[PDB]
Amino acid sequence: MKYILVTGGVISGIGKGIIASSIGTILKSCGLRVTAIKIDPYINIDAGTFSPYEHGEVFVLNDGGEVDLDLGNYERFLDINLYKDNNITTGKIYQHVINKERRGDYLGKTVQVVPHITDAIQEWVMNQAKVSVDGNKEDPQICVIELGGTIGDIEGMAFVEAFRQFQFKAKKENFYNIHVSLVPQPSATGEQKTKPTQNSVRALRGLGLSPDLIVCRSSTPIEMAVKEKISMFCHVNPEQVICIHDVSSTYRVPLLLEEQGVVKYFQERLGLPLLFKWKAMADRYERLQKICSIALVGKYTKLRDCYASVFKALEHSALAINHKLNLMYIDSIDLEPVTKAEDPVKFHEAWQKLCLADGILVPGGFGIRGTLGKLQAISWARTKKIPFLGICLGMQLAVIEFARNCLNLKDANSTEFEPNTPVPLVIDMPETMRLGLRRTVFTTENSILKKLYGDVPYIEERHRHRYEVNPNLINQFENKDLCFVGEDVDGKRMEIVELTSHPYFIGVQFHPEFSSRPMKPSPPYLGLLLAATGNLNAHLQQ
Amino acid sequence: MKYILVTGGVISGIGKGIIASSIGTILKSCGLRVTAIKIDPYINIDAGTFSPYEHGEVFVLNDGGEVDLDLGNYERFLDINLYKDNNITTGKIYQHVINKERRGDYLGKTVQVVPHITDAIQEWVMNQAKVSVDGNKEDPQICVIELGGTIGDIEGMAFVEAFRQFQFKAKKENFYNIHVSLVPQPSATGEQKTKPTQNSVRALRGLGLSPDLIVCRSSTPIEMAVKEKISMFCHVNPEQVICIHDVSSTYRVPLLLEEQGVVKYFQERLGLPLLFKWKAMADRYERLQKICSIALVGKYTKLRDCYASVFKALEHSALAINHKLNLMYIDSIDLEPVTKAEDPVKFHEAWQKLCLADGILVPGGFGIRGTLGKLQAISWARTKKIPFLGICLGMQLAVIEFARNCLNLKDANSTEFEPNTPVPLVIDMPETMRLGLRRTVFTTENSILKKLYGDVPYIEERHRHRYEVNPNLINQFENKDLCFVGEDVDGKRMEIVELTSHPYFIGVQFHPEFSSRPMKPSPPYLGLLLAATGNLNAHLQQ
Amino acid sequence: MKYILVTGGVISGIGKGIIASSIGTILKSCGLRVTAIKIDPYINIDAGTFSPYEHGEVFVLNDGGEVDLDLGNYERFLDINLYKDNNITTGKIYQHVINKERRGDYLGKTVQVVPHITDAIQEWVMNQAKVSVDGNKEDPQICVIELGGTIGDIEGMAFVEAFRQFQFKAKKENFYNIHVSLVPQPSATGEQKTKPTQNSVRALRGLGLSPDLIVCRSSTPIEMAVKEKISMFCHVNPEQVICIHDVSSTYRVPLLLEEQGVVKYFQERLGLPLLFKWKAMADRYERLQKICSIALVGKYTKLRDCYASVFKALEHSALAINHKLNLMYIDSIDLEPVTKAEDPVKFHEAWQKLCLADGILVPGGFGIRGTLGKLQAISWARTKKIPFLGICLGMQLAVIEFARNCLNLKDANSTEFEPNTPVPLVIDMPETMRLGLRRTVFTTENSILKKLYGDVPYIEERHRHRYEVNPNLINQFENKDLCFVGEDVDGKRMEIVELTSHPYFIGVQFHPEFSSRPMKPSPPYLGLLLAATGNLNAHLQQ
Ligand SMILES: CCOc1cncc(-c2ccc(C(=O)NC3(c4csc(NS(=O)(=O)C5CC5)n4)CC3)nc2)n1
Ligand SMILES: CCOc1cncc(-c2ccc(C(=O)NC3(c4csc(NS(=O)(=O)C5CC5)n4)CC3)nc2)n1
Ligand SMILES: CCOc1cncc(-c2ccc(C(=O)NC3(c4csc(NS(=O)(=O)C5CC5)n4)CC3)nc2)n1
Ligand SMILES: O=c1ccn([C@@H]2O[C@H](COP(=O)(O)OP(=O)(O)OP(=O)(O)O)[C@@H](O)[C@H]2O)c(=O)[nH]1
Ligand SMILES: O=c1ccn([C@@H]2O[C@H](COP(=O)(O)OP(=O)(O)OP(=O)(O)O)[C@@H](O)[C@H]2O)c(=O)[nH]1
Ligand SMILES: O=c1ccn([C@@H]2O[C@H](COP(=O)(O)OP(=O)(O)OP(=O)(O)O)[C@@H](O)[C@H]2O)c(=O)[nH]1
Ligand SMILES: NC(=O)CC[C@H](N)C(=O)O
Ligand SMILES: NC(=O)CC[C@H](N)C(=O)O
Numbered sequence A, B, C: 001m002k003y004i005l006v007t008g009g010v011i012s013g014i015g016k017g018i019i020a021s022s023i024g025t026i027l028k029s030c031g032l033r034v035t036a037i038k039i040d041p042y043i044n045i046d047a048g049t050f051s052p053y054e055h056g057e058v059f060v061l062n063d064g065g066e067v068d069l070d071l072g073n074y075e076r077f078l079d080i081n082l083y084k085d086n087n088i089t090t091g092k093i094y095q096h097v098i099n100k101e102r103r104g105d106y107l108g109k110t111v112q113v114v115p116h117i118t119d120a121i122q123e124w125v126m127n128q129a130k131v132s133v134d135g136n137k138e139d140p141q142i143c144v145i146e147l148g149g150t151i152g153d154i155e156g157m158a159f160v161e162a163f164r165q166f167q168f169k170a171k172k173e174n175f176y177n178i179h180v181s182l183v184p185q186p187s188a189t190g191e192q193k194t195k196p197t198q199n200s201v202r203a204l205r206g207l208g209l210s211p212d213l214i215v216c217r218s219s220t221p222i223e224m225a226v227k228e229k230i231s232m233f234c235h236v237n238p239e240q241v242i243c244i245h246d247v248s249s250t251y252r253v254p255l256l257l258e259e260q261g262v263v264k265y266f267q268e269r270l271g272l273p274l275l276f277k278w279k280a281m282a283d284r285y286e287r288l289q290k291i292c293s294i295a296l297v298g299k300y301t302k303l304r305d306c307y308a309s310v311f312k313a314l315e316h317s318a319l320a321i322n323h324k325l326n327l328m329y330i331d332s333i334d335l336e337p338v339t340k341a342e343d344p345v346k347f348h349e350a351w352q353k354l355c356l357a358d359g360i361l362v363p364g365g366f367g368i369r370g371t372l373g374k375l376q377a378i379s380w381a382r383t384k385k386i387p388f389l390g391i392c393l394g395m396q397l398a399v400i401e402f403a404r405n406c407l408n409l410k411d412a413n414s415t416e417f418e419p420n421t422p423v424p425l426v427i428d429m430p431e432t433m434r435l436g437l438r439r440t441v442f443t444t445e446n447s448i449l450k451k452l453y454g455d456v457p458y459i460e461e462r463h464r465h466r467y468e469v470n471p472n473l474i475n476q477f478e479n480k481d482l483c484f485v486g487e488d489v490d491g492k493r494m495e496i497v498e499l500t501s502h503p504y505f506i507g508v509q510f511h512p513e514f515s516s517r518p519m520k521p522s523p524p525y526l527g528l529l530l531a532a533t534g535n536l537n538a539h540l541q542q
């Protein structure tokens, strides 16, 4: 096997996941079966505990793993599906080692970080790198390991020590360390500063890893003097120092690595014998003259990474229909009448952006905060015939609103927001949390989604929810405009709803965005973009 | 005595010198006599060896110290004059300690970094902090020490160890550590990243210093969440974390520290009882509607810091006459006919900027590179009657040009550019280098500079030159338009020249820019700005 | 070329110089021409400034280098003669780099530890390793570099960084790092503790060197469990972990390395094709039943390392005549009547040891402290016919005493102890200090030393002195028992004196001990050991 370790130097937020994913898609073009592992040095077992504002969107895997968004980037660049154990955390490692100790598996000897934690990491990495994520009954050739955090993070030091050892178990032909670092330029009249990269590589060397490649992130391109200053003071050849400046799209990041010679480096060092798909999507993305204005009405809008996969799925869809996406992130609390009292400028900005909405997206979330603002946007969408996609909570709120406003059941809500709701429409219906891949079956042939999903009887989609539509109260909707077109295989759960009277007003209980790929956009997001540009009927008839 | 130690975290180029200078001018307003020390962890004894591209302009002190530009910032914010020993370097320390060892001053014991290097630093700091730079026969109250470099720089670690010890010799009431750090934001849709500041403070704590203040440099203002994240993870109270965002001028940096509570902190901690001058200059700077376009025709233009003091002296002058400065930095090699062959777009950009020149500045430099381009600009200035200031080399080149073009001595040059020049006009005339403060005497009453300098008989100005006008060949100029109005006290050196036939064509052999202050602009630069705006005759008659 | 770097872990005083020397003599037996370099991370240029109590005896080289005793160990194990530049210090490096900077040799760039100090070290090491110390007109094959200090010493970190770089300039076949560490055992009922060795190797790895060999110093032999614990936690194979327990002699240390497999390791790794001399001397040393009791009457007795080379020269001599050496170190201040008042038990112990003296040695030193005690011992030796060797000061004191007690010139002394001595017998006679190799010529055929030195006309011996016998006052001695048998080639200096009336009372102005080798004992020390055992006349007639 081959292993690539991507390390981060100065700060985490430099697109180290996109570098790792781009390295993977380059190797994939070179004919390697690629898997990926994300190491997150946090003590948390899973991302299911997190606020979105902390690390971005909680990505959901088929097995019900709640993990970091970087696992989603692997799945978008490489058409793989990952498992829980492709996320390693300090929590998982320390728990595993503790559990072994209590059984006596360490033979009455003192358990300590070296060897026992570092051995657990190596064991995990070896054994999970052998697991097929590619959908082939064949072990992959190469694992890209991303070491999340920075090389200054004390929690990460066990992992770097593990990789120091692993570099001398697996041979130097099998192990490549890539170091992603920031080169800041505080003003355009000042130089690009290399010192943080020098200092970071000195730390990395102190922990026993030598960069094979150093990936210098900057705004503007790196000057040759600055490249030589990195070469000298990081003790590395100029061929190994690559410049990843800011660009138009992720689609160009593989190409920029190709241009900077990374493909050649890997071909030489691995002994191999292209990115035309990437270049096609990249060049196409520039040439788009048309705009689709989509409103994302989201409580977590304060950091755009909180809706990363959702935005990506819109862009996949928008690219496929040759439109630019104007994604109007609207903080839903600004649409609420509270903000009309307290800060009315934000309210009339938010509602103006909602007027300019060619389509409306109401993504998921947990809690009652911002939920009245979501209901305002859904009311607007329903009545003014503006294309609507509701995901999880956005389905629940649409069903609730239709009950309130069209069935006159104004008392209707969820047992999340008001537990003692008079007519409990949206109830907790556990399996625990309905988490991971589940089979949803269509029970209405004339549904728009069935056609978009390719006239299939069932779909398998990723869920992350506790609450459901209360199956008795479905009788209220029975012969009205709002039809529950998709159910679970066990029938008692409604997982898709459509308004029959609207061009596109779709609620799905699942999260389609996790299943979205560049050359296979998630059908619900496609329908939205199509409807918003009138092209829906054309696409359906074609 | 009191000591303030300003340390830098992530990178040096964050304006740590301006922070240190602003701290000084705040304390000066609080009635303290302030001195300053710059520590430069380089092995170089002095900056006299440097290329300008390395560390910026070589600042010259009255005693003939060739030092860093940060010593010039102290002199501009605090109306002090510094000495050689206010620059400490690793070179100076190690040499001093070596010289002591050879004499036997360390009593036959093994000389090592702790104690002997760290003791030498403490000795130097104590004894030089007692030296009056303020022009008063009274020892100062407070020393601001700037530790240049970063807290990751291995050369600096001896100094940090020295200050750890010094903090326990001088008491905690006498010693304040300020830490200046970068908080980067790689995109405006991403968060402000604190991790480099956390990591830097952890290093600083590891070396035994605790920040009293942490000065977070960013582009945009720091969010309260980010301020709290610094407070928690740097283990410091929110009152100690101050935000220095980007602003219009240096004039606002003292005020921003005042607003962020630094003045209050120092008043409380030092037990003291305002910046109205700074606020006046700041608010005035914004309100300027008029523009003066000055051409700086300079070989070192590639980094603007290579002409820092010169630019500052122009801005002092421009502010005093209520004009904005458009400083057109022109790389002089672009004006040369070589670039008309090789890259003619740069040539016609450069010459266009030279057409738009309300005044021309030809600053100093060493070597023949770019010098033909300087001669092109001086020829333009002389003939088209555009206001000219030549500094050192710019005087030499003007005298050379007048000989070539007005006395027809086309063979005339310096013994620097062509040693075996037929008529050696500009010769090496050592004292070594004419370096530091020298008395220049006016020997022509009707000189423009004498009036600008306040009708004084002599001036004392800072020199840094080897080459002079050859005193025999002065006979060629004797009764022509170009008059040598200023000479040395020993007569044999001509230190100022004027064209009598021009509104303002001045050459000075000294560097007036080092003597420039905000509320006392250097007279040669004033005359340029005045001439370029027609106001010269008005100012002279007033 | 090949390079071996010997590093020390926990403490310096573990015989790291003897390891380095033993490695050299092993390679010498394998047919390699070996040179050596000692790196001393002190800021001192030379050891000429030191007190003996600080680092042991100041060893003198032929060129007049005053260096560490470890250079003397190289010369005793390897029949080489070293030069000044085979001692590298931080002082020498920083001074060289400073001197380059002042000339402008670093081309106007900022001088800093990496690269410029680390490059200076590599330059020095390369160029001095090419120098022939072996007495052959052929460059050596291998340099043993001893990095003095510990791997925790901050002064040494520049050297370790230099060797990290050098390991990647010279190839891995050319560079071997040996790490000498302490394994303490605080009680015999407690385990041998490996943690300091683990921690030291972790530091060494952090600085970018991996041990090829780890040399574990202990009292008792290392247990196999402890050897495996080192193997695991130092991340090294058991073949690389060697046990150097305490043994009878230095003669066994090469053999112990041979047994532990070091010879095999080097044969394999260097690609080579024995220590019978060492084994002969070792086994002979055990079997010695006879004892010679020698008194060393020395002011520096408090640390035996202050007379290291002197003791070694006695042992070389004693081994050659099949006697054990009882070296009675006598602090000369204890023989003085002051100690008869203040602490009379020490006095009567000291004088008892001086009664049991089969021979007396009065070694050199600087100052008047302990010098009256030396005179007491010389008086005893002269009158009671006990074999005497005086070295430098011991010659001066004998000449002084003979003047006092035999010529009745009781006022006679040196201009060192009393500058204004009435009859200044021992005067300062500079060349500076008479330092390094000088030719001494015999001017008396019937001298005992001429015969011992092999009936040669002249000898070349190592000097380190300022003071001499005053050449006018030689007239007092002219026809008496004390004859100046050896002079300088320029005649005006007397460098050897003998009493004609005594079996062996020799003063030499030089230091013969520096020239002593195991299979070539220094003749003055031989004569002492022979005289003390009656064998002198037998050896002379043979
Ligand atoms: C090393 C990183 O360096 C740099 C340097 N400069 C710029 C960027 C950069 C980072 C993020 C984005 C971004 O998110 N762009 C969008 C998109 C569409 S599809 C997708 N991601 S994706 O499906 O995983 C992938 C398989 C196709 N992203 C439109 C939303 N665009 C630019 N990154
Ligand atoms: C902690 C630093 O943080 C920040 C944050 N934001 C911005 C700046 C900033 C840095 C430099 C400059 C600058 O150089 N401005 C000019 C000027 C005129 S006079 C003078 N300097 S001076 O005479 O020493 C001083 C006594 C008056 N500078 C016009 C040339 N302007 C802004 N610095
Ligand atoms: C790695 C060190 O580990 C250990 C472990 N155990 C013991 C010793 C040990 C250290 C010093 C001594 C010592 O000094 N012994 C003497 C002697 C005679 S000759 C000479 N040195 S010599 O001439 O340089 C060399 C070429 C022959 N030394 C009698 C004075 N004896 C034992 N060293
Ligand atoms: O103010 C000062 C004084 C001294 N120095 C010293 O100058 C040397 C260079 O320190 P820099 O921070 O300029 O580093 P660099 O040139 O290697 O990297 P970048 O500019 O690309 O970030 C170091 O030895 C440092 O301590 C400064 O950086 N700044
Ligand atoms: O990709 C990943 C995975 C894990 N982690 C881990 O998350 C934790 C936070 O790491 P961050 O780099 O987010 O640090 P921070 O929030 O303290 O500071 P800034 O964002 O303001 O710079 C650390 O424990 C780190 O190892 C990441 O940073 N990123
Ligand atoms: O009192 C205690 C408690 C805990 N520990 C812990 O036990 C583990 C072993 O710590 P040791 O000091 O026993 O180290 P070791 O066995 O690797 O090496 P030597 O004995 O040969 O020197 C480490 O994780 C340490 O923190 C102790 O050493 N002692
Ligand atoms: N994924 C989501 O949007 C969660 C929605 C809702 N809180 C539930 O648990 O059903
Ligand atoms: N300061 C300068 O501009 C130097 C000018 C010239 N090289 C001299 O030494 O005279």
Ligand SMILES: NC(=O)CC[C@H](N)C(=O)O
Pocket (backbone or CB within 6 Å): C363, C364, C365, C366, C367, C391, C392, C393, C394, C416, C464, C465, C466, C467, C468
């Ligand atoms: N080497 C020594 O013993 C020095 C002796 C005396 N102080 C001299 O210099 O002559």
Ligand SMILES: [Mg+2]
Pocket (backbone or CB within 6 Å): none
């Ligand atoms: Mg963070």
Ligand SMILES: [Mg+2]
Pocket (backbone or CB within 6 Å): B054
């Ligand atoms: Mg720099």
Ligand SMILES: [Mg+2]
Pocket (backbone or CB within 6 Å): C054
């Ligand atoms: Mg010691």
